[PDB]
Amino acid sequence: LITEMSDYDIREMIQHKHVGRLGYVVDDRPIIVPMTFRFSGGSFYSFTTDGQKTNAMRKNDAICILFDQIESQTKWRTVLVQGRYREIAREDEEEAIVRIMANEPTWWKPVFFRVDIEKLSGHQAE
Amino acid sequence: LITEMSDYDIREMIQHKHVGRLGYVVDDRPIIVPMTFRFSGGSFYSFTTDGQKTNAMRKNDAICILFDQIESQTKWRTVLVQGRYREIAREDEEEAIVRIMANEPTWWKPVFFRVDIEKLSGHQAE
Ligand SMILES: [Cl-]
Ligand SMILES: [Cl-]
Ligand SMILES: [Cl-]
Ligand SMILES: [Cl-]
């Protein structure tokens, strides 16, 4: 049985699950890469030192992030964020860095970016 | 430090990591969904009962699968499969089911499919 996750459980997942899997499109083909994200002010913040990822997402800014907690084949939770790559300007990197780090529970030339949310969905199976 | 994974470690991962994250494209936007796969005869076999996934991949058969083993921010292994959705015909479902199940280590209307490999890459960080 697959049901919709409550907003509370979606929120717990996207506040507390550091690692997400980022999807982007190159030449009409999907690529997935694990990244660590911080949800702050309704967007997800991250960075990459991989110029190929940066370039890909500049040319096609339609991206997603999967967060999931998979216990078994029949016990799992998934949250999909669909949105847009928005690259952080040099002038705004210190803001991005503080948003990323400020009051995080866990312990920790990049190009910083955020993911603005166009659709957020969450489901679970018990 | 990010290096290329050996073929042996790539092989260990794609033989033994049941859960992968599937990427596909709808209307130029990426979607990611966790699925369980079996690598057999150079392709990855799976199935879905979700008609929306099936329909999406029929219209754009360019897909990928990420397998990963993430220990920390700096200790991880990733294998990306880029390939094509190839839907299994009714006549071939029993073959698909046996390939999926036959001599698997672990314990376990669908539409069966396989993912034929066009690029396989694997990297790790220590
Ligand atoms: Cl990252
Ligand atoms: Cl910002
Ligand atoms: Cl599955
Ligand atoms: Cl087949």
CATH number, position B98: 2.30.110.10
Structure tokens at B9: 């470690």
- What Å distances lie between residue B105 and B16, B18, B41, CA to CA? 8, 10, 17
Taking the C-alpha atoms of residue A54 and residue B121, their distance in angstroms, rounded to an integer, is 19
Portion 92-111 of B in contact with A at CB < 8 A: 108
The secondary element (H helix, E strand) that includes residue B57 is: helix B51-59
**What experimental approach yielded this model?**
X-ray
The amino acid at B58: R
Residue A19 contacts residue A36 (beta carbons within 8 Å): yes
Place of tokens 């967060």: A67
Q: Which amino acid is at A21?
A: R
- Taking a C-beta distance cutoff of 8 angstroms, is the pair A8, A16 a contact? no
* Separation CA B63–CA A31 (nearest Å): 8
The tokens for B107 are 């314990």
Instruction: Count other C-beta atoms under 10 Å from residue B119's C-beta.
Output: 10
| Residue with tokens 């952080």, as numbered in its chain | A88
Residue ranges in chain A assigned as alpha helix (H): 7-16, 51-59, 93-101
Q: What is the torsion angle, in degrees rounded to the nearest 10, for the CA atoms of residue A44, residue B4, residue B99 and residue B86?
A: 60
Residues 5-24 of B with CB under 8 A from A: 19, 21, 23-24
> Please, are residues B124 and B76 in contact by the beta-carbon 8 Å criterion?
yes
**How far apart are alpha carbons A83 and A44 in whole angstroms?**
10
Place of tokens 């599937």: B22
Amino acid identity of A56? A
Q: Which residue of A has its CA nearest to B50?
A: A2
Asked if A85 contacts A118 with a C-beta cutoff of 8 angstroms, the reply is no
Cβ(B16)–Cβ(B36) below 8 Å:
no
Distance (Å, whole) CA A80 – CA A63: 11
Structural domains in chain B (count): 1
Strand partners, A124: A3, A77
Label residue B120 exposed, middle or buried (CB < 10 Å: 0-12, 13-18, 19+).
middle
Q: CA triplet A62, A63, A65: central angle to 5 degrees?
A: 160
Structure tokens, B84: 């094509």
CB-closest option in A19, A36, A78 to B34: A78
Query: Which residue matches tokens 């991962």?
Result: B13
User: What domain range is B117 assigned to?
Assistant: 1-126
| SS3 at position A18 | coil
Cα torsion A74, B72, A19, A39: sign: positive
* Residues β-bridged to residue A25: A30
